[PDB]
């Protein structure tokens, strides 16, 4: 049963049983801002709220489970002084505190492209962070393994540090992560469901979708979007 719960991710995840989730693929909610350190204070207050969700994720994740976070660093130019908040970096260092093992991230190259020194380089990438729960991975059955095997060409395209062939993140981006880090039958959660990209990706490949979304309006849009992308199946929404 593909589920999507409406409510605060921190509260909802709190009502789920430990080690019942195999994979988390998600994108942290949008964060936007006279003023000295007032900005970084709100910034670190944001991180404090994300940490609460990551902490719950570390609980409901099975050992060997993984938390995948797709994040771009928040830039702010004309304090008109150009400044970039290193979100991906902060999230990485903070997850170590929650007990996650950090793995190499995959660089999502989203945007491909007075000539004097000092020019600002435009943002072209988002980071796909990988945080693993240690302890000793579970073992999928022979059938699960066989049905989750990736064709050679897809394997070599997916498992590389930089993805430059995928211009809310795209379904194809989510389908890759679901296929790379879970097996058919596994539960794939997204604490910040949005329009349900991850749920659609998970459901589409024989995994069980489990999501949480704050705004009830978006929850409904996802169910409809879900019913279109997942022919025959439906997205159960509750509060």
Ligand X SMILES: C[S@@+](CC[C@H](N)C(=O)[O-])C[C@H]1O[C@@H](n2cnc3c(N)ncnc32)[C@H](O)[C@@H]1O
Binding residues for S-adenosyl-L-methionine, as ranges, are 8-9, 195, 197, 213
Comparison of 9 and 25: residue with beta carbon closer to a second copy = 25
Rounded Cα–Cα distance for residues 108 and 220 (Å):
29
Tell me how far, at minimum, the Cβ of 225 lies from a second copy, in Å: 26
Looking at the chain, the residues that come just before a C–N gap of over 2.5 A are 33, 78, 113, 167
When binding is defined by CB under 8 A, the residue of 33, 162, 166, 215 that contacts a second copy is 162
- Indicate which of a second copy, ligand X, none lies near residue 1 (CB less than 5 to 8 Å, by partner kind): none
DSSP state of 30: P
Find out whether 126 and 70 touch, Cβ atoms under 8 Å.
yes
For a second copy, which is the closer residue by CB, 5 or 207? Answer: 207
List b or e across 151-167, with b for residues whose CB sees 16 or more CB atoms inside 10 angstroms: eeeeeeebeeeebeeee
Distance between CA atoms of residues 105 and 131, nearest Å: 9
Binding-site member from 35, 134, 168, 216 for a second copy (CB under 8 A): 134
121 sits near a second copy (criterion: CB under 8 A): yes
* CA 197/CA 222 separation, integer angstroms: 8
Q: Does 78 sit near a second copy (CB under 8 A)? A: no
Contacting positions for a second copy (CB under 8 A): 40, 64, 73, 75, 79, 81-86, 88-90, 92-93, 96, 101-104, 106-107, 109, 113, 115-125, 132, 134, 137-138, 145, 148-152, 155-156, 159-162, 179-183
């Amino acid at each position: 049963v593909h589920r999507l719960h409406v409510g605060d991710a921190r509260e909802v995840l709190a009502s789920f049983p430990e080690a019942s989730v195999h994979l988390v693929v998600t994108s942290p909610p949008y964060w936007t801002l006279p003023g000295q350190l007032g900005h970084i204070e709100d910034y670190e207050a944001f991180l404090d709220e994300l940490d609460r969700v990551w902490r719950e994720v570390f609980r409901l994740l099975v050992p060997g489970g993984r938390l995948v976070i797709v994040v771009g660093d928040v830039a702010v130019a004309r304090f008109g002084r150009h400044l970039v908040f290193p979100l991906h970096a902060d999230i990485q260092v903070r997850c170590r505190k929650l007990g996650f093992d950090n793995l190499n991230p995959i660089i999502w190259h989203k945007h491909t492209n007075p000539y004097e020194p000092g020019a600002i380089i435009k943002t072209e990438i988002e980071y796909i962070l990988m945080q693993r729960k240690p302890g000793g991975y579970r073992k999928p059955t022979q059938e699960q393994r066989e049905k989750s095997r990736l064709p050679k060409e897809d394997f070599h395209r997916f498992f590389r540090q930089i993805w430059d062939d995928i211009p809310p993140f795209p379904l194809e981006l989510a389908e890759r992560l679901v296929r790379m880090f879970s097996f058919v039958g596994d539960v794939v959660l997204d604490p910040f469901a949005g329009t349900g990209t991850t749920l659609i990706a998970a459901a589409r490949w024989g995994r069980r979708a489990l999501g949480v979304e704050l705004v009830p309006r978006y929850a409904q849009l996802a169910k409809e979007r879900f019913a279109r992308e997942v022919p025959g199946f439906s997205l159960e929404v509750l509060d």
